[PDB]
């Protein structure tokens with residue numbers, strides 16, 4: 477019964493998921509002045525040309541665009557990573573207002589939304605194994621700011637009407653995730669966690685410095701989704717973000733400057 481309400485939101489999660497108060501939780505604030513440039517990170521490799529999207533699902537907390545991860549088709553390598561990480565799904569976190577919605581912050585600034593492209597380390601065989609390991613997942617995080625429309629997001633926005641409520645899904649084949657990336661792949665990286673229960677400390681975070689721009693109309697459509705199931709009182713799917721957690725004994729590294 478976790479969620480984003482007053483009764484069941486982030487401040488309550490520790491009761492069912494004690495790791496909520498752990499040593500490597502996410503998201504965090506990225507203090508740009510304290511992040512250190514690391515000239516050794518190796519180049520970052522996003523290989524999405526053969527991606528095979530399958531379906532879009534409203535899971536009651538966000539919507540997920542799911543991919544075929546039974547073979548190396550859409551993979552993340554390089555940067556801080558050792559080995560090959562397969563794309564399994566992406567989703568977003570967003571606000572009720574344009575000045576909130578991101579999970580990570582940058583010098584305390586919140587963006588309107590944040591995209592998470594979730595990948596798992598192929599050495600562990602399946603995603604359920606990978607989330608048990610400290611280097612199991614690599615999440616590419618991309619900030620969204622409100623301005624000009626993002627063309628590559630529009631196919632997602634257009635299908636949302638068909639998955640308004642929890643448990644609805646729709647076919648979502650032939651979607652190209654390359655259309656959601658910014659120009660630059662400059663990034664920050666740090667070890668962290670899933671930002672929703674079970675909050676497992678299995679993620680190498682790769683947060684891009686450059687946000688993408690989406691239109692007010694695009695993000696308004698996100699906010700028409702429902703957390704509730706069909707035939708239940710309407711609760712708009714907004715403010716599905718976890719706030720920044722303590723950095724503790726971690727360093728955030730920059731790929732640039």
Ligand SMILES: [O][B]([O])([O])/[C]=[C]/C1=[C][C]=[C][C]=[C]1
Pocket residue numbers: 592594615669670671672673674
């Ligand atoms: O850290 B997020 O990318 O927000 C969470 C991803 C996540 C994926 C599968 C199961 C539970 C959570």
Ligand SMILES: [Zn+2]
Pocket residue numbers: 567568569592671
């Ligand atoms: Zn997420």
